[PDB]
Amino acid sequence: GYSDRVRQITLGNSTITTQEAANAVVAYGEWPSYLDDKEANPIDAPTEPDVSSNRFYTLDSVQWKSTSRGWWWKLPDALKDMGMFGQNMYYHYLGRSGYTVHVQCNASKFHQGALGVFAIPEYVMACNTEAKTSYVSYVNANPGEKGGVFDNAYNPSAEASEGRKFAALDYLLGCGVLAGNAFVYPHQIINLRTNNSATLVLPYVNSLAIDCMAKHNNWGLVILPLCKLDYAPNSSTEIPITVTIAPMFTEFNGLRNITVPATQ
Amino acid sequence: GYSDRVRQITLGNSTITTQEAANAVVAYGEWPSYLDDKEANPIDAPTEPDVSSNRFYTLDSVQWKSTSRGWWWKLPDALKDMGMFGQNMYYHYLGRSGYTVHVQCNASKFHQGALGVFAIPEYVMACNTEAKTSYVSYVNANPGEKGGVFDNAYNPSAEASEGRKFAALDYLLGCGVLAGNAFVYPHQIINLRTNNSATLVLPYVNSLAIDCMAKHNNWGLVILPLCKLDYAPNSSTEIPITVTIAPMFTEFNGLRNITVPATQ
Amino acid sequence: TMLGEILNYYTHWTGSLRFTFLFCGSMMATGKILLSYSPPGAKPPTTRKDAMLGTHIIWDLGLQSSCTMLAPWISNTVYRRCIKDDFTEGGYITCFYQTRIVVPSGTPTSMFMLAFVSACPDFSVRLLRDTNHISQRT
Amino acid sequence: GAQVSSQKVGAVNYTTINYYKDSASNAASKLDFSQDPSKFTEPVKDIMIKTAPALN
């Protein structure tokens, strides 16, 4: 009865079902966990918000078209305005979190296409001016739940002030490496003939036990069309991709007044 | 060495000291606690924010003058905009909390005066129009950290629409009972010759295990000058009264989107 | 509903409510649907991003035809009243496309689902009363 | 022939004697908490395990 294709995930007051999964990935074979006393750093008693924040948040959906070049988000950035997770994040200097990432994309037995879904630690991307290096604004680096898109062209700006955004060039993974090698990162593929969802469980990954969430994204989430969407009755059709992410084993230190980042 | 006058209270990242206390009151002899399984009601796993919210929040100070008639606050209303406590309160349908209330008022060995400090369960107060009964607006009932003041005169409104506030008449305790009997409620007195602070530890009190914090205040906090402030070199002098309150054993159920109450 | 009719012979109710949905499109139709229960006291949800902050389930359409969403017992009072009443309000149930329903050609592009309600084993009622659902002339 | 039984709790026993020769004369039947909702909610021939697929 039980199947690699059928799964339920419950976190807090939220549940996901899928009937066309393809197993699930646990990044680097490690489930998330709380921070042990023998690896701890800040000494204040941490806040562990548990069910208030460790639950599925669904981002705004994006549309997959035959011409789409792909999508990216950063974490914890994409969830910074999500319910109590966002509040706990911004009221504290320090935070750590794992995640369950559930990417959703159904179609029909007559559609075709394949999405690579990658979780990338320290997903540093190229800037869009050749007058400077590492020249990206905080606002452009941290788009929140809307994330960003890849392009198949690189057109760096005439003036440095206009190029302070990522050059998200698809085939170089926005960072000067070949996209065909992205499979070294934890990943699944949503191949429409096979499955309609990808599930990745991510431990906290960093060179520190805990860090400043508002300064530093631990993971990138990349969705790249490896094989373009095609549908014979209408090649211009679009199908939604929906991203739903739950923080897990969240832990926060250094409580004070709320952080309100710059918006422009 | 140890003394009824000298106390330290630590909750979360916050500590209070006093060197001229007068013991401390534990209302009805009961320390606050979490809700037991055998008395529970809502069945979702609760959020217990612990140190993020169970900590001392200091309200705006008020000025005690020879002419002051007194001050009131409601709880959890007075703390509704306080850090993570406020966030947890408003993101949930249900909440319960105990409190440590620490009222602070120092002067000198040459000043005199006495404040009654009372914690009143279900502190229902009279309205200020005789055209209606029980006719008080949500906004006027829930002033937040600014609280309200008592008056020594009752002047109900000419029109019902203008009297939708409390008639906080001091000697009737704003509710038709004689203020001299307020001592049946958990209380201390700040008598300037003796002490400079009052400390009251309050359990959750209600006819239910847990309730809607945004609808219902469980406790009133009343500060009444029983003997007027006097200071011979300047009878018009004013001394601050500062109220600092820590939620304790907070527990919340029924997570959803955030409650944003009407402001006018 | 059958539950509603039984409740109208009682004054008080308590417990969890089960909402089961049966998708009745063609086998070729796929989709993901979000079903949510938001306990009361906040802005009623009219968008998916508010609804998903409450208790919810994401239903993937497939071979298993039906999905159950629970409104778990989450209440201030130990019983709610079997009348419209602000004090014992129960909250908000909503539903949104999580992705969308997708069909291939030669397939109906509009279809239906059926919603069912039932009480859970934690459910009970009190205080027998006459119903307002039956009457006669005199 | 007195029967002593537990009362329904209020905010603990009571006594009953039957005075009549016909059981039809008796007061209400004692609380019967019997139930088997599954004869209406799950009257299926083959057992369905919740955690399993309903159709396999």
Binding site: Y2, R7, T17, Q19 | - | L22, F123 | T41, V44, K50, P53
Partner: peptide, 27 residues
């Protein structure tokens, strides 16, 4: 006899899917 008590449970990530059924069965 009482109505059902609620057990302490956390979350799951599992091939057990009690949220899905098929009411065509008559259940």
């Amino acid at each position: 006899p009482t109505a059902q008590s609620t057990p302490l449970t956390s979350g799951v990530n599992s091939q057990e899917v009690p949220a899905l059924t098929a009411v065509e069965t008559g259940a």
